[PDB]
mmCIF file of C-alpha atoms in Angstrom:
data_model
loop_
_atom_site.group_PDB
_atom_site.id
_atom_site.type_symbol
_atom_site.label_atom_id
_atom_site.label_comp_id
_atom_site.label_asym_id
_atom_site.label_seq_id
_atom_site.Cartn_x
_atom_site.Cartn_y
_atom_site.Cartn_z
ATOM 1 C CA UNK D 1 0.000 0.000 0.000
ATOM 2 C CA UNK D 2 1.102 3.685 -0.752
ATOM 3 C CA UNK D 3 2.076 6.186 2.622
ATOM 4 C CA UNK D 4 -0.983 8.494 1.870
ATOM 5 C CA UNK D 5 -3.539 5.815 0.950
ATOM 6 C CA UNK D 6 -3.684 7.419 -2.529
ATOM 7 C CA UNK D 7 -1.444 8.343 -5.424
ATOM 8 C CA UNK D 8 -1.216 11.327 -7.236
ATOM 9 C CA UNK D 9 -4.512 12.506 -8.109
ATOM 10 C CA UNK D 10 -6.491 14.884 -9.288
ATOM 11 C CA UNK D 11 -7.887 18.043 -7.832
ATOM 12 C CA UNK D 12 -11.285 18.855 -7.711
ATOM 13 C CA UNK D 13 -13.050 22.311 -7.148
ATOM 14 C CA UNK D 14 -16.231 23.299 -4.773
ATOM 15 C CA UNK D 15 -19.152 22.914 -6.612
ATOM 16 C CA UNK D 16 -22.574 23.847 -5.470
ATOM 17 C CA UNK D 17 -26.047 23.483 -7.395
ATOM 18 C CA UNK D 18 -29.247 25.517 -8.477
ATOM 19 C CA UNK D 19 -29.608 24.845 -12.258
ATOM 20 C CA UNK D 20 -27.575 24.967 -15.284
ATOM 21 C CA UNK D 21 -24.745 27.450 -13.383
ATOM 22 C CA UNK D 22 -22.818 25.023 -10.640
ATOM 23 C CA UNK D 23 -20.718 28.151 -9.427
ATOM 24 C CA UNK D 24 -18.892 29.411 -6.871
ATOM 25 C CA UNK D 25 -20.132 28.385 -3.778
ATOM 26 C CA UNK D 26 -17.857 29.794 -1.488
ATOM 27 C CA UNK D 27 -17.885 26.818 0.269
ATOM 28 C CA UNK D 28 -14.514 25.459 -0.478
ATOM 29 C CA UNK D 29 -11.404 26.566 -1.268
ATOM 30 C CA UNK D 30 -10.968 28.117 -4.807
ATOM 31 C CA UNK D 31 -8.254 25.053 -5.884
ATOM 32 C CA UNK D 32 -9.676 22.743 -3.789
ATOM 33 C CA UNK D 33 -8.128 19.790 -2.703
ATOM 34 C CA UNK D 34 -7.827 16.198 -4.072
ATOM 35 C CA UNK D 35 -10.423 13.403 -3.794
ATOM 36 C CA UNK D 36 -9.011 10.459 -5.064
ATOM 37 C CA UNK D 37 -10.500 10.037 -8.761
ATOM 38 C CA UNK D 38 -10.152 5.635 -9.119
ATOM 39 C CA UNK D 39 -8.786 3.215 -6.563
ATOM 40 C CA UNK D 40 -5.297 2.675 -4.436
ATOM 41 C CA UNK D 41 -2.470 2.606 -5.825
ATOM 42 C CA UNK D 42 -1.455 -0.971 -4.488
ATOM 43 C CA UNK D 43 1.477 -3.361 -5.504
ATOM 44 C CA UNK D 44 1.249 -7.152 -4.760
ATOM 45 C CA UNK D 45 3.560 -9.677 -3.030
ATOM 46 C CA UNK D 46 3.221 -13.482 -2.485
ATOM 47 C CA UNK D 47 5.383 -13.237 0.801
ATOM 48 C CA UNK D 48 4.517 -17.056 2.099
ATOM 49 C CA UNK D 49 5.997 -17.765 -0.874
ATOM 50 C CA UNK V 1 -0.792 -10.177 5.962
ATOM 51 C CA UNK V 2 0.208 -13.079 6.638
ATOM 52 C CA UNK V 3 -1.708 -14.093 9.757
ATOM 53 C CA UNK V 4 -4.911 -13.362 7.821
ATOM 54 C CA UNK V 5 -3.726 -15.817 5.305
ATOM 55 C CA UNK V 6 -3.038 -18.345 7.733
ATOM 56 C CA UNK V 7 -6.904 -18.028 8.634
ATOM 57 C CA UNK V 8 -8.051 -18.103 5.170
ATOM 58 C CA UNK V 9 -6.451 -21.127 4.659
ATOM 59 C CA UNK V 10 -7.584 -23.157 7.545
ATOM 60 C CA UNK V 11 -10.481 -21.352 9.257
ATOM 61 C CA UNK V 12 -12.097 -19.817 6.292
ATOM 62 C CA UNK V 13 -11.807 -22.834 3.785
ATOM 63 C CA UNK V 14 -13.264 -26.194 5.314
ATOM 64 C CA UNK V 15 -16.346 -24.861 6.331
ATOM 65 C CA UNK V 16 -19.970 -26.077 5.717
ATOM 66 C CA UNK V 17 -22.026 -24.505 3.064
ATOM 67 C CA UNK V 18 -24.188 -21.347 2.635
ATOM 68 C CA UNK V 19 -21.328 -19.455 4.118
ATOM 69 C CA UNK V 20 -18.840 -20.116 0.970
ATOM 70 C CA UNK V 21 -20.525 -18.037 -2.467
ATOM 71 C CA UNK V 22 -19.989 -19.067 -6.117
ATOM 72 C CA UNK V 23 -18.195 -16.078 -7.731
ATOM 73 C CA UNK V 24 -19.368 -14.625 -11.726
ATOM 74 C CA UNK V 25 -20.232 -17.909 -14.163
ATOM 75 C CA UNK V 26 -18.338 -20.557 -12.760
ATOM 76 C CA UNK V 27 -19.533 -23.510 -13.657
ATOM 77 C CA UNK V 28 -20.102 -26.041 -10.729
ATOM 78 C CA UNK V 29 -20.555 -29.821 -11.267
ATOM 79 C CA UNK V 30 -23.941 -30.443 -9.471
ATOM 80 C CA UNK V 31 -22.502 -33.334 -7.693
ATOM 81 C CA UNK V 32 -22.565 -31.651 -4.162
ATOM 82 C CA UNK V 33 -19.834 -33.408 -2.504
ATOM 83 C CA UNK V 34 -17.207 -34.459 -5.854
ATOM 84 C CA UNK V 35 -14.069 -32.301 -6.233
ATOM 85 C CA UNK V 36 -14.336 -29.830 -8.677
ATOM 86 C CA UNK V 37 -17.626 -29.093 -6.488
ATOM 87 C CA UNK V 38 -15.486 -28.236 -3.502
ATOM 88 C CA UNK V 39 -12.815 -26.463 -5.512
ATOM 89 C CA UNK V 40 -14.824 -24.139 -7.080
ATOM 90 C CA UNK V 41 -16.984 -23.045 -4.372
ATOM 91 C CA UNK V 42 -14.814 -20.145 -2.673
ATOM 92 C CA UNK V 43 -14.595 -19.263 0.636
ATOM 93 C CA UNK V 44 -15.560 -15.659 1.999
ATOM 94 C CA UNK V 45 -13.143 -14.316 3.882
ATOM 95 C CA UNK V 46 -14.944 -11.804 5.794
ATOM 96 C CA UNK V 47 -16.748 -13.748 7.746
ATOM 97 C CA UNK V 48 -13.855 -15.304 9.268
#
């Protein structure tokens, strides 16, 4: 398994929702911060054999 | 990882049935009890 519990990844904005607009909520930060788009990042061992 | 393979391999397998699941299109022989029966009927290892 990786330190983090996830690779490099991308980063995804604050979105919020009325209609058509899904603008600037000013909810979260204006970068935002990664969430993980997929699954770990593992590598695989056979270490009883 | 290695003491939950230890479990797997003793405590998971050789249990009764309805506990072990059938994964996607495996075909099993309907012979409850032959081998290829008991091979391809996997154990879960969640439950233990």
């Amino acid at each position: 398994f990786p330190l983090g519990g996830s690779a490099a990844t991308d980063t995804y904005s604050g979105i919020k929702a009325n209609g058509q607009t899904w603008t600037a909520d000013d909810n979260y930060a204006d970068r935002g911060a990664e969430i993980e788009s997929g699954n770990i990042f593992a590598m695989e061992i056979n270490l009883a054999a | 990882n290695l003491w939950r393979s230890f479990l797997y391999s003793n405590v998971a397998l050789y249990l009764p049935d309805s506990y072990k699941i059938t994964p996607d299109n495996i075909t099993l022989p309907e012979n409850k009890n032959t081998y290829a029966y008991m091979n391809g009927r996997v154990a879960v290892p969640s439950a233990l």
